[PDB]
Design a protein around this ligand. Sequence first.
Ligand code: AGS
Ligand code: MG
Length: 307
Amino acid sequence: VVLSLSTAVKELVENSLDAGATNIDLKLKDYGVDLIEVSDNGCGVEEENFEGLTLKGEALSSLCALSDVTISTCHASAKVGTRLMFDHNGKIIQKTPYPRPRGTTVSVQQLFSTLPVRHKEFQRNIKKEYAKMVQVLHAYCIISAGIRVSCTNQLGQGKRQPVVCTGGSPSIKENIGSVFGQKQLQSLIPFVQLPPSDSVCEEYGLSCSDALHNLFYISGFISQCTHGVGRSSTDRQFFFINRRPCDPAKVCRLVNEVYHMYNRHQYPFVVLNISVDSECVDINQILLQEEKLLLAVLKTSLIGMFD
Ligand SMILES: Nc1ncnc2c1ncn2[C@@H]1O[C@H](COP(=O)(O)OP(=O)(O)OP(O)(O)=S)[C@@H](O)[C@H]1O
Ligand SMILES: [Mg+2]
């Protein structure tokens, strides 16, 4: 799964999160076309697993096949950090001692250079590819409370441009502020979950028995129903299932729709996390075992907030 620029950065960012990082700094050159560097203060890597970094689903090895990967890392238990250079077959070319703080820094140089067709497509469509990355990055930024995530992009030898930056704030609300400015917050109301209404249940084919296994816990923010306050498109709508950025099609349609019942010419800003038992999530598209109930809960709740 190194099929787009966004999927390459998401994979890297997730690695940092899983490593328990509280600081994740992403450096990009030429919109990532020349360099995508992710620096974190997570747990780092132990020497026993160096040879196992590009091996054993498993996109670190992929990145080596598609680009020149350099990794510096240091575990708490380590006396000294290490700098590693990998060839495209995921083999360690070089290995040298390197004093550095605990954490890992992964450098992806000349992404797709080994696939000349894909590499040029990536350059021509850079705008769209970059835009998509930025969306993914904003998601992880918003939901990652307590974690400082920063990103800069540098074009040519020009100055490093700011892309996004969070302050390690404890709430999602604060992250939204960091990412989009304090003016966006001001046109948002917090999500308030309500039991599914009798009428909304009626239209979904739900009954008194269908509504007790409700295990859905929803939280987040949405733009008010006030005239003008909305957006001009769906460019700022982020959905998450158990803190993981995803795209539940039906949930998205419902949200944008209930909003339109109040604001006809605008799309709302959306940040919604769907907390669920992980055993009720499938992959195939996403299947949530009780979608009707969730949809019911969503609509009821949105209706109650907007009135
Ligand atoms: N930032 C990091 N800090 C510490 N270890 C890392 C970091 N990035 C990668 N690794 C290590 O490299 C191995 C991982 O990655 P894969 O991306 O190849 O890993 P996965 O972590 O098993 O991820 P999936 O399958 O994408 S969910 C991991 O098991 C980690 O031990
Ligand atoms: Mg991974």
